[PDB]
Each structure stands twice: as structure tokens, then as C-alpha cells.
Design a protein around this ligand. Structure first.
Ligand SMILES: CC(C)c1ccccc1-c1ccc(O[C@@H](Cc2ccccc2)C(=O)O)cc1
Ligand SMILES: CC(C)c1ccccc1-c1ccc(O[C@@H](Cc2ccccc2)C(=O)O)cc1
Lengths: 268, 268
């Protein structure tokens, strides 16, 4: 029924708005949009990075570049920390999806284990425009100019993500659309190791329905936005395959040091 | 208008019939050992494939191979020639898709460059069952076991296709459906290096409507076949990656080994 697919959509939207502090409405207001009530700290230069890292609410290392660790790393590692933070919020949102918690525990884990990268990159697109990405709960902005330039085993990692964000974003989805889309991704059915696919796909089926109606109602004048959004899943899949691909190579830089035991742990 | 959408489906389907000698229907008929108006010769081992040269049109060698272009080589040289036929056939089909020949001459070649293989492996599924694949116009059937048991490299070329086929064939799509879906795969847009794009998204936006209605009509007792089908698109993407990189390998160990110019120009 329609009335149901309309309920699920509001429920999901509510949980989402809760599980996630910075919404895409808020990220856009801050971004290109005006809504200038407290402009962010822009990081465009190598010196600009130092200059704000000592007053921009970040928890890890302080501005100390000169024979004391590097910057190309300090930046890539930070993405991994915040993302781990983001993972907790996603795990919470998941439990808010009808039927999710009723699934076998082993499968709740597996779904989360393989769906997070996709969820992360989808949301990160909310914080990105063609010129840059909002950093630290939006208290900052790291230019696409700087990032795209950093050293060698990194500037190759970012850029392609910006390519995906502009395309994805060209879809002009909002948090109401995305809350369901994120639910669909989670409730897949083809993740390796699932033990009981039936219930999972049963749920995704309703979510796909809710998403379809959502896009129809929310983007009436938008031809095949449903189909268009679904085929973006490959973009994500590729971006996530490419992410590990370079998440491995990094295992040929900062490595053998006996000071990262409990830290390398907290971030697998 | 849906009456105009059923018209586009007839059209694509007629051209599909006219461009591909071996439809899924002909293939299923042959595969189900049921209809034996003409069954296949089964290649499951060295002797099978050996005695097979005399049972079907195998211009290839029959006698010794290990020192005169081994079997693993003859089996993949032929696969190469079937690839050049498919491209020729698929190219013929593309000219029949409304708007395609109008597009910028350059892009026509690009949509083909990329799209030619995703469609190949889609259709190659019509010729497979969890046990093997039809060859030489259905005259023969090669085991999924025999293939995998070839040399170190080659022996894993096919296993990934079989994997996809079993799950793809699970959708129970038919020739009329594939026709519309095959068109979509070509009129993509998110294709790397396309001068004009919008002109393409307007075409694919229409096909998508054609497919959407075609699935609801053709498969009523189903839910989200449309969505499940589109999601299957990434499955093809992945296959492409692995194939090309695995193709890169044989190109070095086998210096004398070539690669048809049509196909070589396609690869990047
Ligand atoms: C098997 C590889 C190593 C090979 C060796 C020598 C000559 C040709 C090939 C070859 C490899 C892959 C291959 O797949 C086709 C695509 C294809 C595969 C199966 C059926 C139809 C089309 C392609 O690369 O264009 C075709 C030929
Ligand atoms: C099935 C494709 C993906 C493939 C991948 C890797 C290696 C081989 C193949 C392959 C593709 C087409 C193919 O069809 C040939 C098989 C064949 C082989 C020897 C002699 C006649 C036909 C055909 O129909 O002509 C055989 C193998």
C-alpha cells in the first residue's frame, strides 16, 4: 500500500535526522549556499593547514610539520578516524530499519561489515562540492585544490571521489530521499557469507518500494530518477573497490613501528 | 505514453531477433535435454574436445597440442573470434536503437568501446547453466569443469562468468526483456570520455521507461525485477575489470599471442 510506503519513509527519515548530526541540508547551507551564520575555516594551502589545525576542533595531532611526521598521512588517517566515528552512527541507524534487528546476528554484522564503505562515500558526497569538502562537523573546508595535491600515494586517492560526488550530487537528492537509499544499500542480499537471504531481500523489497514512491512524489518532474539512482551503485562499488586497492598499498609507507599497537587496532 | 512504450519494445525486440542468431529461447530449448530435435555434443575432457573437432565445425587442431598450440590456447583463440562476431552483431543492433546513429560520431564509438563486453557476458548467460556453456551456434556444450581445469591462467578466465550467469539467469528474463536491457547498457552516459552526454541520458531515460513497463507486464508476479535487474549492472562492471587484467597477463607470457585489432582497440 501507498500509505505504508509513506510511513516507512517518515520513520526512516526521523531516525536518520537523529543518527546524523550534520544533514545534507545543513552541509549545503554552509557550502555554496549562502546561509552564512558562521563561515568555516578554509584550508587551501600547506601553511593554511597548519594554521588551523591549532584551533580547528580536531582530536589527534597538532600542527607539527618538519622532520616530525608528514602531512599527506596525517590527512588520510584523519579520514579513517572520523569514518570510524561515522560507523557507530550508521550501525545505530541500521537498527532503526524495520526488521533489521530481528535478523540473525551473524547477518546483521555481515550486512554492516560490507555496507559501511558504501554508506560512508554516499554521505561524504553530501559534504562535497566541485571545489571541496567540509571537514570537522563542518567547522572547516578542505579545498579540492589542496587535496588533489599532497604527495604521491594519496593525491591519486581523493580526486576520483570528487568525480563521483559531482555526478551523484547532480541528482539533487535530499535527506528524505537519502535516508531510504541508505537503507536499501544496507539491506542488500549479495554480501558474501549471509546465512539467510530471504528476510533481507524481503525487507529491501519494501525499502525499494518506499524509495521509488519517495522519488516519485519528491521529484515528480524527474524522469527515471529511481533507475538513475540505482545504477549509481556501481559507481560506489568501484569507488569502494578502488579504496581498498589503495588502502592496501598504504601498507608500504608508515608501517613497522611499535607505537601503533592499540591504535592500528582501533582502525583495522 | 505507454502505447508508445510498447512500440519501442517491439522495435528493439525485432532488431534483437534480426541481429542475434542465437536467442535465449533457442538456447534454452537446446539446453533442456528435453527438445532433442538436435542436442549438443558434450566436451568434458581431452578426448571429448578431441573427438569434438569431427562432430562440429572446429577449424581448430585436433591432434597434439602441448607442442603445437596447446588446447588451452585453441580454446581461447576461438573465444576471441566469437568475441569479434558478437561485437559485429552488437554493433549492428546499436544502429537500430532510436537516436543512436544521430549522436556525435565520436561517442558512438565510445558507447561501443565500453558497452560491447557488458552485453556480451549478459547474453553469454543465455548459453549457460551451472554446468557449462553452448559453443559453435549451440552445436556443442563445454563443461564448466573442463574449462576450469586448464592451465594456471586460462583455467580461471571462465569461472567468473559462470558465477554471474547462474545468478543472472535466476531473474528468468527472456529475449524480449534482454532486448530493452541491452539497449540501456549501451545508452549509458556515465561512460568515460563522452563529448555530449545529455543527448544520451534522454535516450536511456526513454529505454528505461520501456524496460520498466516491459517488466511489469512480462513479469507481474514479481517485485522489483526492474531494480534487481539494474543492480545486476555492477556485476557486469566487476567482471570487466577482472577480465581485462587477466587478459593483460596472457599478453606478456604469450608474446606470440595477439589480439584482434577491433578488440584490441576496444581494450583500455
Ligand atoms: C583468453 C585470452 C588470453 C585470449 C588469448 C588469445 C586470443 C584471444 C583471447 C581472448 C581473451 C578474452 C576474450 O574475451 C572477449 C570478450 C568475449 C568473451 C567471451 C565471449 C564473447 C566475447 C574479448 O576480450 O573481447 C577474447 C579473446
Ligand atoms: C565465455 C567467455 C567469457 C570466455 C571467457 C574466457 C575464456 C573463454 C571464453 C569463451 C567465450 C566464448 C566461447 O565460445 C566459443 C567456444 C569454442 C571453442 C573452441 C571451438 C569452437 C567454439 C564458440 O562458441 O565458438 C568459448 C569460450
Amino acid at each position: 500500500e501507498s500509505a505504508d510506503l509513506r510511513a516507512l519513509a517518515k520513520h526512516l527519515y526521523d531516525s536518520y535526522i537523529k543518527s546524523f548530526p550534520l544533514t545534507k541540508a545543513k552541509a549545503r547551507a554552509i557550502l555554496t549556499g549562502k546561509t552564512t551564520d558562521k563561515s568555516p575555516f578554509v584550508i587551501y594551502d600547506m601553511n593554511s593547514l597548519m594554521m588551523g589545525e591549532d584551533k580547528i576542533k580536531f582530536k589527534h595531532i597538532t600542527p607539527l610539520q618538519e622532520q616530525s611526521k608528514e602531512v599527506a598521512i596525517r590527512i588520510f588517517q584523519g579520514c579513517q578516524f572520523r569514518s570510524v566515528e561515522a560507523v557507530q552512527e550508521i550501525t545505530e541507524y541500521a537498527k532503526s530499519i524495520p526488521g533489521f534487528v530481528n535478523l540473525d546476528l551473524n547477518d546483521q554484522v555481515t550486512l554492516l561489515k560490507y555496507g559501511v564503505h558504501e554508506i560512508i562515500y554516499t554521505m561524504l558526497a553530501s559534504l562535497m562540492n566541485k571545489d571541496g569538502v567540509l571537514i570537522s562537523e563542518g567547522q572547516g573546508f578542505m579545498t579540492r585544490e589542496f587535496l588533489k595535491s599532497l604527495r604521491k600515494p594519496f593525491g591519486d586517492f581523493m580526486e576520483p571521489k570528487f568525480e563521483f560526488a559531482v555526478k551523484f550530487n547532480a541528482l539533487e537528492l535530499d535527506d528524505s530521499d537519502l535516508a531510504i537509499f541508505i537503507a536499501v544499500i544496507i539491506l542488500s542480499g549479495d554480501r558474501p557469507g549471509l546465512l539467510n537471504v530471504k528476510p533481507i531481500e524481503d525487507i529491501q523489497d519494501n525499502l525499494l518500494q518506499a524509495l521509488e514512491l519517495q522519488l516519485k512524489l519528491n521529484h515528480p518532474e524527474s524522469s527515471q530518477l529511481f533507475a538513475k539512482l540505482l545504477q549509481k551503485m556501481t559507481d560506489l562499488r568501484q569507488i569502494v573497490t578502488e579504496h581498498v586497492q589503495l588502502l592496501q598499498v598504504i601498507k608500504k609507507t608508515e608501517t613497522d613501528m611499535s607505537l601503533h599497537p592499540l591504535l592500528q587496532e582501533i582502525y583495522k
